[PDB]
Coordinates of C-alpha atoms and ligand atoms in Angstrom, one line a residue:
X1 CA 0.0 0.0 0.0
X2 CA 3.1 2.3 -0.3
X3 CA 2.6 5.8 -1.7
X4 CA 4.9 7.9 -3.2
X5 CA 4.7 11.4 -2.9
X6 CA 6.6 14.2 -5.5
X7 CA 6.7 17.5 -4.8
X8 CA 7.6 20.1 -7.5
X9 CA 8.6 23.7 -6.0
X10 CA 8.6 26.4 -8.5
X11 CA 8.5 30.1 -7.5
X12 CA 4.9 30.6 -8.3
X13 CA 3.6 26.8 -6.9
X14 CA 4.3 24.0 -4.4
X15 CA 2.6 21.2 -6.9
X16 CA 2.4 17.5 -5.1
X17 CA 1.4 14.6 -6.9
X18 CA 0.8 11.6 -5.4
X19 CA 1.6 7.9 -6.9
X20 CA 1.5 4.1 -6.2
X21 CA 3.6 1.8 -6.4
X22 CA 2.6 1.7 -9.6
X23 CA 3.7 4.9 -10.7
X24 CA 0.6 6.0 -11.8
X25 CA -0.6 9.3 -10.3
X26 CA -3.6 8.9 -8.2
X27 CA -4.3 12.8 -6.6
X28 CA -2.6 16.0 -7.1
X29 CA -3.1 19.3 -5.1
X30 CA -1.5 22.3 -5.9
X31 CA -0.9 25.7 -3.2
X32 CA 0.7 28.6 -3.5
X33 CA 4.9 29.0 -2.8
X34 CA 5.2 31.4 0.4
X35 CA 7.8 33.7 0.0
X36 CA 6.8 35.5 3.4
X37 CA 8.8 33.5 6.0
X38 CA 10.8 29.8 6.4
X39 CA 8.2 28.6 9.1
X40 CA 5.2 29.3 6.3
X41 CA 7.2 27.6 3.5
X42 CA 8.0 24.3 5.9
X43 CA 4.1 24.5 6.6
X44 CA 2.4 24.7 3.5
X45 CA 4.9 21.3 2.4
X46 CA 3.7 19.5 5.4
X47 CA 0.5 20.4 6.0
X48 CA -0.2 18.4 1.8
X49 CA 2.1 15.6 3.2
X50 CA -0.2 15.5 6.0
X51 CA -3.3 15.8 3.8
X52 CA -2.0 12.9 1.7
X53 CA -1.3 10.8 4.3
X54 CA -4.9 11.2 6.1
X55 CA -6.5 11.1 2.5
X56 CA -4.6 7.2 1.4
X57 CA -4.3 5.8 5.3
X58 CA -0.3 5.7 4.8
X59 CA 2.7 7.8 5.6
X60 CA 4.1 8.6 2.1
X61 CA 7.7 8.8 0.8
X62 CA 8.5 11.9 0.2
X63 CA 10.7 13.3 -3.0
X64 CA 10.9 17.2 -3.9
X65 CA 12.6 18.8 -6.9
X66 CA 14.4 22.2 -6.4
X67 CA 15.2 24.8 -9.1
X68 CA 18.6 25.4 -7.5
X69 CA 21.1 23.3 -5.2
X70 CA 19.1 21.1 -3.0
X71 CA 21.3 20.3 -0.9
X72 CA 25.4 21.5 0.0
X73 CA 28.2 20.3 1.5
X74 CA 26.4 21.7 5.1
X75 CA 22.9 20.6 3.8
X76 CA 22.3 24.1 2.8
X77 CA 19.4 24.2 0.5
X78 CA 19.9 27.5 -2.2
X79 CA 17.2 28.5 -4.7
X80 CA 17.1 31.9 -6.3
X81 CA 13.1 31.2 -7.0
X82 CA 12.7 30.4 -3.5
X83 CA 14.1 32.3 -1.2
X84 CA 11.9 31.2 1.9
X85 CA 13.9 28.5 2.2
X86 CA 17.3 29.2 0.6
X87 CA 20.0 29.4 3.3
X88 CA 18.3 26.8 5.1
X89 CA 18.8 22.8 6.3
X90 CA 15.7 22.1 3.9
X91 CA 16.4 18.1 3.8
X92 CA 16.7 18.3 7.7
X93 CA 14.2 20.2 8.8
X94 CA 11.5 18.5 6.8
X95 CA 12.7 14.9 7.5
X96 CA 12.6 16.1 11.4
X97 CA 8.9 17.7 10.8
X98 CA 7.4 14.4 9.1
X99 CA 9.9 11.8 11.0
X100 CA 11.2 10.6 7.4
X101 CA 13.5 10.4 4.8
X102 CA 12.5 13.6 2.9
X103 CA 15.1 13.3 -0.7
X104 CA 15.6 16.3 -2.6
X105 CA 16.8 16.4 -6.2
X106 CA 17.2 19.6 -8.8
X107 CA 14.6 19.9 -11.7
X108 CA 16.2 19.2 -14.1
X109 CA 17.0 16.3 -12.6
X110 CA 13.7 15.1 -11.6
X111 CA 12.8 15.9 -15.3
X112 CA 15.3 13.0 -16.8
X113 CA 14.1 10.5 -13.8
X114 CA 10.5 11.0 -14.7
X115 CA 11.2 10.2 -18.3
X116 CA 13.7 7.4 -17.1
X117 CA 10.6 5.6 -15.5
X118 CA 8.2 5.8 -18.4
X119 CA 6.9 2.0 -18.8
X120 CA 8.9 1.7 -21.6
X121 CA 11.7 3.0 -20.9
X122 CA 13.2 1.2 -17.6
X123 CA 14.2 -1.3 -20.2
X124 CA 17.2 1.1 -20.9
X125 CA 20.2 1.4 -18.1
X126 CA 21.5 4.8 -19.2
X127 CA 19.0 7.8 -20.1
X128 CA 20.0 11.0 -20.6
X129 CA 17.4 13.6 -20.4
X130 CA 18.1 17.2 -22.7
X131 CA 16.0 20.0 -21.6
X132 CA 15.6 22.6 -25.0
X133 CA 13.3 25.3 -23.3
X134 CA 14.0 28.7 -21.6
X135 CA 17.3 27.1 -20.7
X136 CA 19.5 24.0 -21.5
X137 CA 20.1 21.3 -19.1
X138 CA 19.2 17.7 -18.4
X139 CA 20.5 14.8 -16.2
X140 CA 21.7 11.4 -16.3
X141 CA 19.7 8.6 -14.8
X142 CA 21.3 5.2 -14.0
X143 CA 19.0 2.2 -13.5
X144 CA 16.8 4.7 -12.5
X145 CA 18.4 6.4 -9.8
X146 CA 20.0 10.0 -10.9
X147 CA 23.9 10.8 -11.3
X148 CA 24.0 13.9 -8.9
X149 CA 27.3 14.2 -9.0
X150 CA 29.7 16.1 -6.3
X151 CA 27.3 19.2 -6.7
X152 CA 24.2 18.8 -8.6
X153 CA 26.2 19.8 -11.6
X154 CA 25.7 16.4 -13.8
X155 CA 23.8 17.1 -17.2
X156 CA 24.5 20.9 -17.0
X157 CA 24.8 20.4 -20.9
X158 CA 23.6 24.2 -21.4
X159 CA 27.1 25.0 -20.2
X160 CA 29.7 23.0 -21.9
X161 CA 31.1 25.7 -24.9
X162 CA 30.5 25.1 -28.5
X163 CA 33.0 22.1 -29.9
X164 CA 35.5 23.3 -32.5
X165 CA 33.6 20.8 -35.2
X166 CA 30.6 23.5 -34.5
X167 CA 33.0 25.9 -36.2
X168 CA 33.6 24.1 -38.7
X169 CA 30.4 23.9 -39.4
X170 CA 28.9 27.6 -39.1
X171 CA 32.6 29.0 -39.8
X172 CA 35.1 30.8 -37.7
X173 CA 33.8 33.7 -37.2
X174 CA 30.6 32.7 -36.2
X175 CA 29.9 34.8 -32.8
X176 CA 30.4 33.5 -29.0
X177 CA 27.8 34.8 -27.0
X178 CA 28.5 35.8 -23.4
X179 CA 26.4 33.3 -20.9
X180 CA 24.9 34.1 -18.0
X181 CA 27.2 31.7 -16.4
X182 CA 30.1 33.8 -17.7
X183 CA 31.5 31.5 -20.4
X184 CA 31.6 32.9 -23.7
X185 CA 30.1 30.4 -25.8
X186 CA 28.1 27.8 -23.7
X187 CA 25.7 26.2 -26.1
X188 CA 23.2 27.0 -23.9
X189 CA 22.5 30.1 -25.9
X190 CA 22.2 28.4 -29.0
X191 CA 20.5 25.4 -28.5
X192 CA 17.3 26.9 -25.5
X193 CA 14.2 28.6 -27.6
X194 CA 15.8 31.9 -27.5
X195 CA 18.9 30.6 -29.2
X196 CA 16.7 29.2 -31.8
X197 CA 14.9 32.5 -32.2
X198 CA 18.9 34.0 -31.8
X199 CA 20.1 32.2 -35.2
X200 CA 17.4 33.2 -37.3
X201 CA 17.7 36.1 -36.7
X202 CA 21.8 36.0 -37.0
X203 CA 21.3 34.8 -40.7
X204 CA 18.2 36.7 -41.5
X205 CA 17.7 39.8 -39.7
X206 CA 14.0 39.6 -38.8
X207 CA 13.4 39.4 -35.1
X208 CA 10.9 36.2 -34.7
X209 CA 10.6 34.3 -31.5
X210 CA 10.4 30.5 -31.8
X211 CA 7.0 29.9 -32.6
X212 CA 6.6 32.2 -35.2
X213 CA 9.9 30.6 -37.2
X214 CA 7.9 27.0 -36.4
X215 CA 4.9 28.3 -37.9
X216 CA 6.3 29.7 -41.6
X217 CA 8.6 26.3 -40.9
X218 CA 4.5 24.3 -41.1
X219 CA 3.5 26.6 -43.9
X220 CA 7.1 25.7 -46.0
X221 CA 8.6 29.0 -45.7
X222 CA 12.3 28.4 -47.2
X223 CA 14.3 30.9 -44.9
X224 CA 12.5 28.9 -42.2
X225 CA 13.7 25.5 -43.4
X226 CA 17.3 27.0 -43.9
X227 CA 17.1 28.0 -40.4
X228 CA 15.9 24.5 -39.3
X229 CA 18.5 22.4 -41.0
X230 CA 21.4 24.9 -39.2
X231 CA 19.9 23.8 -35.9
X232 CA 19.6 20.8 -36.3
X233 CA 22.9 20.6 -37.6
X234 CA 24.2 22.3 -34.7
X235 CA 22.3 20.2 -32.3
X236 CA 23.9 17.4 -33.4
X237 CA 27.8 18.6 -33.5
X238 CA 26.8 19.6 -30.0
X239 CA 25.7 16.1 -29.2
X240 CA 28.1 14.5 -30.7
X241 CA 30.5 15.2 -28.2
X242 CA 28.2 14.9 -25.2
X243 CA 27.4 10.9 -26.6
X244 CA 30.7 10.5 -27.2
X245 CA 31.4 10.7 -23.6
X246 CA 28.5 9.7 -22.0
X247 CA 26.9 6.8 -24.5
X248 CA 23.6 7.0 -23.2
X249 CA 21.1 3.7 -23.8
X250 CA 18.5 6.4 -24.7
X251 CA 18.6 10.1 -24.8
X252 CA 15.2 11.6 -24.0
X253 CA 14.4 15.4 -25.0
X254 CA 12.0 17.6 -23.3
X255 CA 11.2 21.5 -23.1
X256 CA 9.1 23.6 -24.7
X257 CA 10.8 22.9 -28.5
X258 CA 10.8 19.5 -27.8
X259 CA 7.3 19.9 -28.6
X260 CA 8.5 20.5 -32.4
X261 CA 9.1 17.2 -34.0
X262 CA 11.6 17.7 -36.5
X263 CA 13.8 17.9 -33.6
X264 CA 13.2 14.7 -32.5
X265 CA 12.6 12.8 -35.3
X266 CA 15.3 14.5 -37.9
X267 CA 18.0 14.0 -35.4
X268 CA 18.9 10.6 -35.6
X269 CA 20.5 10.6 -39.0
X270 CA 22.7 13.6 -38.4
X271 CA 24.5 11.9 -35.2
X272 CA 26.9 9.2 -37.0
X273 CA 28.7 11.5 -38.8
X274 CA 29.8 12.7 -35.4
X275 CA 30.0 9.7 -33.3
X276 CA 32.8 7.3 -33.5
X277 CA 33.0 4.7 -36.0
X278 CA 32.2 2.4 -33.8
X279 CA 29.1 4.2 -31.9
X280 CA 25.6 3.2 -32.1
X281 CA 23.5 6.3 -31.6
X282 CA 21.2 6.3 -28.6
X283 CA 17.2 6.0 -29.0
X284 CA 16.0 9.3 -29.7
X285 CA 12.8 10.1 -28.2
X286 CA 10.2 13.5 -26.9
X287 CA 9.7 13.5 -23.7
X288 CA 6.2 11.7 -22.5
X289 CA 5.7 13.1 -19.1
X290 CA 6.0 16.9 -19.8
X291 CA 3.6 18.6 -17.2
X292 CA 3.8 15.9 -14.9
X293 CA 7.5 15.4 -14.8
X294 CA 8.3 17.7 -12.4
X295 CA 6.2 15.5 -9.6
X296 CA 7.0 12.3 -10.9
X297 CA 10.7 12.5 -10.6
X298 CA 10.7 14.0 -6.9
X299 CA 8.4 11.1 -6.1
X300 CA 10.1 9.1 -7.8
X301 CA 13.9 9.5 -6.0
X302 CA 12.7 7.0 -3.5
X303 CA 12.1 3.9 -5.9
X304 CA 15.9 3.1 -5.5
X305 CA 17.8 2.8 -2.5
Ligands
LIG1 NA1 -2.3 28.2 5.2
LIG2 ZN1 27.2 29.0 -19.5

């Protein structure tokens, strides 16, 4: 009768979604994020951990994804989106409040696990999960338990610069844009929905945000097909040397362009050219679990050891 319980924090919502052992999502309930004070933000988590455990006659695991670092060295938690609770022993002080092993996890993190568990794909040891939204990021999920790494850095593949082949391909001169990170060149701002929106207008010098470029793309506008093939192409030089290191089983993609299918399904046949000879490339596959991905990977951190 063991329920699992996921938890996605954003800075607008505390979203919990609750799951069998199973995995299939049996209530949800969604409250506010308070930003007024810690004591408010500890409460509003327990009092739906509470209300779940009343509601299903069990006390829950519980799982909760962070947009930030969920846990230091110290057990600090730090989230710029949630500052009632950065600075704080998060972890501890929930696990003390509802006498249990409360695991924390980052996002993007919980993103790639929630895909990792989808009923087809536990068959695969090794799944990568690429985030192409606002940002770029992702994880790496091994027999479905996530690669954390020393700091919650694994899968930051938004930050690793552009590979010399990318050069090669868009020429020399092609510009290295500043990331917010710091980096000059991070692919990150090529590869997220602005950068998509960023090279279009590099090569045509009309200012059109993602959608609109998708939509002349539907209609068969040339420019916009131009534009498409460069992506793609870049999306792949780019991958090339992240699967060259990593060899993922299946690579999964998710974010808002992930919901354009050329970039799942046109993918595939650009990667040989930059894998070694040797390489198979990984499944390639859009994400299944998009608005519920956030809740099912938090829950979903307590299904392994
Ligand atoms: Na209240
Ligand atoms: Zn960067």
């Amino acid at each position: 009768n063991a329920m699992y319980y996921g938890f996605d924090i954003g800075g607008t919502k505390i979203a919990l979604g609750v799951f069998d052992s199973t995995r299939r999502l049996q209530w949800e309930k969604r409250v506010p994020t308070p930003h007024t004070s810690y004591s408010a933000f500890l409460d509003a988590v327990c009092e739906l951990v509470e209300e779940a455990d009343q509601r299903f006659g069990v006390k829950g695991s519980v799982g909760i994804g962070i947009p930030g670092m969920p846990e230091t060295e110290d057990g600090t938690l730090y989230a710029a989106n949630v500052p009632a609770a950065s600075g704080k022993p998060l972890r501890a002080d929930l696990s003390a409040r509802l006498d249990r092993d409360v695991r924390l996890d980052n996002d993007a993190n919980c993103f790639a696990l929630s895909e990792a568990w989808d009923d087809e794909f536990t068959q695969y040891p090794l799944v990568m999960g690429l985030i192409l939204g606002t940002g770029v990021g992702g994880g790496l999920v091994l027999n479905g338990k996530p690669i954390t790494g020393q700091s919650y850095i694994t899968g930051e593949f938004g930050h690793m610069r552009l590979p010399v082949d990318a050069l090669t391909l868009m020429g020399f001169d092609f510009p290295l844009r500043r990331c917010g990170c710091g980096q000059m060149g991070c692919i990150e701002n090529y590869l997220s929905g602005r950068g998509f929106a960023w090279l279009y207008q590099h090569y045509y010098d009309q200012s059109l945000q993602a959608p609109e470029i998708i939509a002349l793309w539907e209609q068969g506008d040339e420019q916009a097909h131009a534009h498409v093939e460069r992506y793609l192409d870049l999306l792949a030089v780019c991958l090339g040397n992240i699967l060259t290191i990593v060899d993922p089983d299946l690579l999964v993609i998710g974010g808002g362009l992930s919901n354009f299918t050329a970039i799942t399904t046109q993918l595939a046949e650009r990667l040989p050219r930059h894998l070694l000879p040797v390489a198979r490339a990984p499944r390639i596959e859009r994400a299944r679990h998009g608005d519920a991905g956030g809740m099912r990977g938090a829950a979903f951190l307590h299904l392994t050891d």
